[PDB]
Design an enzyme around this catalytic site. Sequence first.
Site, short mmCIF file in Angstrom:
data_model
loop_
_atom_site.label_atom_id
_atom_site.label_comp_id
_atom_site.label_asym_id
_atom_site.label_seq_id
_atom_site.Cartn_x
_atom_site.Cartn_y
_atom_site.Cartn_z
N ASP F 56 0.83 -1.20 0.00
CA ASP F 56 0.00 0.00 0.00
C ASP F 56 0.87 1.25 0.00
OD1 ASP F 56 -3.02 0.40 0.19
OD2 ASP F 56 -2.32 1.85 1.68
N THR F 89 -3.91 4.95 -3.94
CA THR F 89 -3.00 5.77 -3.14
C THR F 89 -1.67 5.98 -3.85
OG1 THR F 89 -4.04 4.69 -1.25
CG2 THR F 89 -2.18 6.13 -0.83
N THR F 90 -1.19 4.97 -4.58
CA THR F 90 0.05 5.14 -5.34
C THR F 90 -0.18 5.99 -6.58
OG1 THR F 90 0.68 2.94 -4.55
CG2 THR F 90 1.99 3.90 -6.31
N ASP F 393 -8.45 -2.58 1.43
CA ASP F 393 -8.54 -1.93 0.12
C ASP F 393 -9.69 -2.50 -0.70
OD1 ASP F 393 -6.52 -0.14 0.53
OD2 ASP F 393 -5.23 -0.87 -1.08
N1 LIG Z 1 -5.84 -7.24 -14.12
C1 LIG Z 1 -5.38 -6.01 -14.46
N2 LIG Z 1 -4.99 -5.74 -15.73
C2 LIG Z 1 -4.54 -4.53 -16.08
N3 LIG Z 1 -4.43 -3.49 -15.23
C3 LIG Z 1 -4.79 -3.62 -13.94
C4 LIG Z 1 -5.30 -4.92 -13.47
N4 LIG Z 1 -5.57 -4.77 -12.16
C5 LIG Z 1 -5.26 -3.50 -11.82
N5 LIG Z 1 -4.80 -2.81 -12.88
C6 LIG Z 1 -4.37 -1.39 -12.89
O1 LIG Z 1 -3.21 -1.21 -12.08
C7 LIG Z 1 -3.24 0.11 -11.54
C8 LIG Z 1 -2.50 0.18 -10.21
O2 LIG Z 1 -3.31 -0.31 -9.14
P1 LIG Z 1 -2.66 -0.41 -7.68
O3 LIG Z 1 -1.44 0.48 -7.67
O4 LIG Z 1 -2.49 -1.85 -7.30
O5 LIG Z 1 -3.76 0.28 -6.74
P2 LIG Z 1 -3.32 1.43 -5.70
O6 LIG Z 1 -3.01 2.60 -6.59
O7 LIG Z 1 -4.53 1.60 -4.82
O8 LIG Z 1 -2.13 0.85 -4.98
C9 LIG Z 1 -4.70 0.50 -11.44
O9 LIG Z 1 -4.88 1.82 -11.95
C10 LIG Z 1 -5.44 -0.49 -12.31
O10 LIG Z 1 -6.11 0.21 -13.36
MG LIG Z 2 -5.20 -0.35 -5.34
#
Ligand SMILES: Nc1ncnc2c1ncn2[C@@H]1O[C@H](COP(=O)(O)OP(=O)(O)O)[C@@H](O)[C@H]1O
Ligand SMILES: [Mg+2]
Lengths: 52, 526, 105, 43, 260, 536, 49
Positions: F56, F89-90, F393
């Site tokens: 996170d 958040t990232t 989350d």
């Molecule tokens: N199965 C997937 N295939 C392609 N892109 C994805 C998939 N799952 C999540 N993503 C993308 O990855 C990006 C990063 O998400 P993540 O960084 O894990 O969430 P957070 O920003 O809350 O930590 C998201 O904007 C999402 O659109």
């Molecule tokens: Mg996320």
Amino acid sequence: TNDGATILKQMQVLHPAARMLVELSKAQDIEAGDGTTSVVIIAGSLLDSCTK
Amino acid sequence: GHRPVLVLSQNTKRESGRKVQSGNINAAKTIADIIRTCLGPKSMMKMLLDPMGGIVMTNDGNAILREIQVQHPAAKSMIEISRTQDEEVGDGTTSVIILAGEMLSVAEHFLEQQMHPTVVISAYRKALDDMISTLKKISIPVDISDSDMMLNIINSSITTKAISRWSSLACNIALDAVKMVQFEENGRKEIDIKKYARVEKIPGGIIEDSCVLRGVMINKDVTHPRMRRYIKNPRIVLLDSSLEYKKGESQTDIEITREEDFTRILQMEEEYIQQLCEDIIQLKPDVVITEKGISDLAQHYLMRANITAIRRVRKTDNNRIARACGARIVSRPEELREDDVGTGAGLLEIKKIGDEYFTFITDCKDPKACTILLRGASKEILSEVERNLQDAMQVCRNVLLDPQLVPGGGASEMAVAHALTEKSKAMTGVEQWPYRAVAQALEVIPRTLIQNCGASTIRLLTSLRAKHTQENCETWGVNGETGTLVDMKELGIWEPLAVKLQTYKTAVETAVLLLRIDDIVSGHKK
Amino acid sequence: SSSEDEDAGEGISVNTGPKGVINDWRRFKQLETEQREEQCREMERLIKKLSMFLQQYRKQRMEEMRQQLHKGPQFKQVFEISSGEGFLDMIDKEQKSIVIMVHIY
Amino acid sequence: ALWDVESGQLLQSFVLCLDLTGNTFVSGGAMVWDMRSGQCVQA
Amino acid sequence: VVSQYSSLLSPMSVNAVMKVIDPATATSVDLRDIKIVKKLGGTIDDCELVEGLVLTQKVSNSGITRVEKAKIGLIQFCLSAPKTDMDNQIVVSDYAQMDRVLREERAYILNLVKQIKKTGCNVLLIQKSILRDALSDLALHFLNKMKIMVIKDIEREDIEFICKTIGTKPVAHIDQFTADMLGSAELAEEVNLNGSGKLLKITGCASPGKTVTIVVRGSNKLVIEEAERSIHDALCVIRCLVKKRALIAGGGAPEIELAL
Amino acid sequence: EGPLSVFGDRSTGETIRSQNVMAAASIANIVKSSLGPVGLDKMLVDDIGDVTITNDGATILKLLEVEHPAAKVLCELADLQDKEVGDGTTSVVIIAAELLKNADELVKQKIHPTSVISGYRLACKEAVRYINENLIVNTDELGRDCLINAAKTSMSSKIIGINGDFFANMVVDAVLAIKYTDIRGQPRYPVNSVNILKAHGRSQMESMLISGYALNCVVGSQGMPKRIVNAKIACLDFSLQKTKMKLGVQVVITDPEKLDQIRQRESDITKERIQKILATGANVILTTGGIDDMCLKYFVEAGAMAVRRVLKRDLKRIAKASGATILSTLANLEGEETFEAAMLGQAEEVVQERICDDELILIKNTKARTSASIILRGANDFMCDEMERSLHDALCVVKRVLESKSVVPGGGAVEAALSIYLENYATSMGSREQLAIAEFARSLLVIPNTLAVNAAQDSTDLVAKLRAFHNEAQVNPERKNLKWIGLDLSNGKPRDNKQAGVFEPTIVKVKSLKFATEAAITILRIDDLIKLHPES
Amino acid sequence: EAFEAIPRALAENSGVKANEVISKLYAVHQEGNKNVGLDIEAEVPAVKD
Ligand SMILES: Nc1ncnc2c1ncn2[C@@H]1O[C@H](COP(=O)(O)OP(=O)(O)O)[C@@H](O)[C@H]1O
Ligand SMILES: [Mg+2]
Ligand SMILES: Nc1ncnc2c1ncn2[C@@H]1O[C@H](COP(=O)(O)OP(=O)(O)O)[C@@H](O)[C@H]1O
Ligand SMILES: Nc1ncnc2c1ncn2[C@@H]1O[C@H](COP(=O)(O)OP(=O)(O)O)[C@@H](O)[C@H]1O
Ligand SMILES: [Mg+2]
């Protein structure tokens, strides 16, 4: 901040003239509330002219 | 002046990339190599030097790992998983560490070859699912009513410990204690060997004199010497409140203006003690045990009614006494009733062992708690014997909860490896290679057994693999003493299915957790 | 409901005072001069240097041979200096044309 | 300085240590002050 | 910095000044009549002008966070066990006196709460108290049983502002707690700021006398502080325009004309 | 030093602007490697050996020791995004840092910062409008599958990603269980009412979803029963101990005969209270305060459970779920001390359950309301903590999807479409606001670029293909369905993410855009730094 | 097997997947062509004489 009075108060100036300028900006803020930056500039320009 | 300006605070380090993964895998491998030699019936013990001046001479993997202080976070994770394996099933502690180290070792190869850790983790999870399926498939049922089968299972559990010399006595003690602790009330089965199977170690004597008692045993003596130290069929009353005059909760001050008030108040204190003792006596007991003090006047009043009193017994010991003799702990003696009186103890005997007095409440009829009296050469020997007995009792309770068994001596490892390879033969994606890597890394247990036995690893392992390639050979393992292949149906080394499942799950999950990690950051405060 | 985010006169030219205090001045000056002499002897080397098949010599073995069989009487020990003033007056005294070798250890 | 606890207001402002009827108190650096008059009464 | 939000802030400041003065009589503006509340979260576009009263204190009640047709009363005494100003102790010399003391304390608290409730009050504000328990657990339980929303720990310095806002005359002794001492309001509820905190807003009053509150919201603390300073500058500009009814051109025109 | 005479250091102009951009870039680079399904976790060591394995962004930024003011601004921006949304958040930090970098690059070209700020504000407003008008998908056309897909998407990059097929079902079931309507007819879902208990042991796939509530508490006495079938739960907010007089009450004895009666009453008061509570028929007694030994004995003899030191929030949740009423005292409006059966909660079972040498209370099938609790099982404590963070989350994402019924395609589709649209739209507004909006659009592309980079794939080629697809969708009226095309990181090719089930709540994107724009503007306003020397 | 480190290093430096290159090299060499190595000037794993 952009407020002149806040800028003058926050930085702890040491020279007496700077302290009087801070008090001047505070007085302008009390009486008017706007123009706390213009008044200090006016005073500085007036003293700069006083030099010559 | 002009102090340096920087984004993150000082002494905040950060490493990233292949270096972090390599360091984590190397730390896990080092942790595994620490206790690599403590696996199998031919394992050799290690002598640990406790910081507080003590000595821990043990063979258990979890004890060795928890006696070691490390700095690398991966080593901390490995020690944590060893502790979790110890707490969950009671053994398999040194097997799970080796398995996790081997899995990380075989994952490093794929990490070095431009494979993302997510693919490796997915392959590991699929492998773990198939491992669980195969382990459940190759399992066999157990009749828990058969005492011989349970004793053999406990033996197979303790053949690798220092207690294997007295294995028969140890197995009998463990089985008896576990079956005695077993309880069921309000439709809730419970085997609480942590709180109701107490191990008491008395240095000296011989280990053959150690036994499990049909009762409890505490290191206490009579409050007054006139009290009987030997009662045949005692009626036991248990208390957790003081039998002495004490100040009240509210702030209270007396005010004396006449002469007789002082003596009157002292006489009322004496009369209160007498009233409490009479309330206790009205139930006609034979012995009174409490957790708080007993006044001298209370001792006199109890002795007048021929009652033995033990003064300050710990809460856990009092609970064990209540379970063993069928009593019920009460706080206010005026509310004591007949049901609370504990009948069921068959003997109260306060004898002297060495230079100390010990109280025995043994000979109970149907006790739900017990004490294990251990005699031995010294304190360290008794501590190791206690650890081995804990392993045996944990294995027995695991078998009682789950009556499934799987072959030992590495037979399960090779069988699951062969099944996983056969399943992978149909895989077409890139995930098949780490899948087969996990399958083959499972073979680290029989290899370690062969190495500890001293036999040739390559020839024996190749022969075992070739034997397992046949059809009805899932029970073929390695004899850890003679260094030869043998069917586990003949050697009889079987281990609970729950232990193997927990070991496999913990190893795979630790490998996944350490593979998920990159970009170590350290140095910040809280 | 309850279930929510919760849950002047500079020129002095002092006249007689120096005469009155010369006793204490020289009392301190003698010790200060001794300290300067000691530290000069030390700084003469310290800091300044602290900052930075006939060749096989078969004769070395026989050199060791008669160095071992050198003399009969007791071989004595290396003199040990116990005080800094001891080193100072050891080097200051003694004949000038005689080499003195000191081993800091 | 002496402050009213309940109202949180400065009653009167007048000293390494001092000690105290909550009307006459002595402060040492004696300096006895009376709150009824707000003046130094003893020295 | 709040210049893209000027379309929202400038009418806000103009209304805030105009709603605390009499346009035809006022010669000066008291800026203490415009309370500014800074709450982290959201964006500057979420800045709101509240006609009524905004309190940062939390509601001591559970399950009662919204009252319609509210009747708010201020309490400057304590709802706890009786305690005289001079030193007092209760001496128990018999066992019956113990539960007599307990029962009499319960009766005293119950009578206090019943007297408060009989006036029709459903929102109670309790002034902050030191050296005595302003609100007791028994008193809170009794008030909750009668469906009265209780907000305690009200600062002394804010009493005048609250009285000017919602028209509630403070009460210091239960004998003087009557119906006419209360302040009617349309709604008094505790709102949730999208997980950034909770605010108690009393909006809509029978006698909203010359008092307005401005709620400033933003992404970070620094921008909230600067937005508050800028809003203060705008309020001071309108105050200047009120003090002396004279307008001049800007953009350096007065300075150039003065120099020439 | 100089004529200003200020005790401190001063930086002005390009120097301080570059310092701020450097700090923002450092913060972004700290968490840039933990984005998307091919992201990786991090170890954080707390100077005393405490290890936090986390993915996170908010946790990483809170645990770090940050000194520069702009870095603190970005860290608190991440914290605000976590508090107000719970996801992205990232992404918000990365977007804010990229916006600041491109804005500073514009400023270095003598473009005034006011024009850049105006362009950024206009671009943010237009992007939000375009998202709300074109890229939103109503969840009514999908059903329960949309919630599962959103939860699975949120669980990517987390330690529970591969087991998403099971974890997402558990999350959706819990969120639907904790649902209840309120006044004005707005069904809102109170997350954080799902108690999450962490206990190491068996694998993640053996994590349990309790159809009730779970307490991290045990029965007070070993003599009590450890299972009650038809539980009559009584919730109390007071201690059951020996009665003690308050400060203002004193006991002064002049006749000694009264001392015994007083001492007897001191415990008989609590005895009578407990007798009433048991006489009403209660089987389980939960109190926030302590319980003395004699009271425990009373409960033992009555054959009823008694749990002490229960957390206030846990007790509130239990009372709400079971229909019980919290009682801080036994005092009716008649001045007496009673306890009627109408204040008793009910549950179909209350069990003392053993979980890896630890015991906890399970309140199963509470009546009058449904409640949910989740027990997570993992290899060790760090893994369980990361599981809890990922679970939170996912729960927040599901709550956002259920409250606001619109979702947007994931995997960089929204950012690419917004970049194309804003690059086209910048030509119709202003002269230098054109450059500002174009830089905003190009900064929006950092998300797909980071996603592709984390997968060790050709970021340039993949982003070019995605941009071509979205441009074709925007320019050709009959190819509008191409706007759902995102990034498939497993194969490194563009993919229709709407059909693939990669969904995100619209609120995440909108709030991220607004917060990042405001943070970038706040940092961009600075052009002078005065750093006073500390007085210490 | 240690001889695989040379084409593996070449493919890794070239920016392609080494495993695919080695698989193609084994396939083409089993076909009978012993003068075939990895194509540097290619964005995907490819081999040529
Ligand atoms: N199965 C997937 N295939 C392609 N892109 C994805 C998939 N799952 C999540 N993503 C993308 O990855 C990006 C990063 O998400 P993540 O960084 O894990 O969430 P957070 O920003 O809350 O930590 C998201 O904007 C999402 O659109
Ligand atoms: Mg996320
Ligand atoms: N839109 C504008 N166009 C031209 N000049 C302006 C504009 N807005 C403000 N000014 C001028 O900027 C000067 C400074 O105002 P400001 O910075 O708001 O407060 P201060 O007078 O305290 O510096 C004022 O004298 C005003 O005339
Ligand atoms: N007599 C034996 N012959 C061969 N293998 C054995 C024998 N006894 C035990 N083993 C094997 O050794 C393992 C147990 O070793 P042990 O030291 O208990 O490790 P752990 O503490 O991890 O359980 C089991 O997997 C079992 O298959
Ligand atoms: Mg074992």
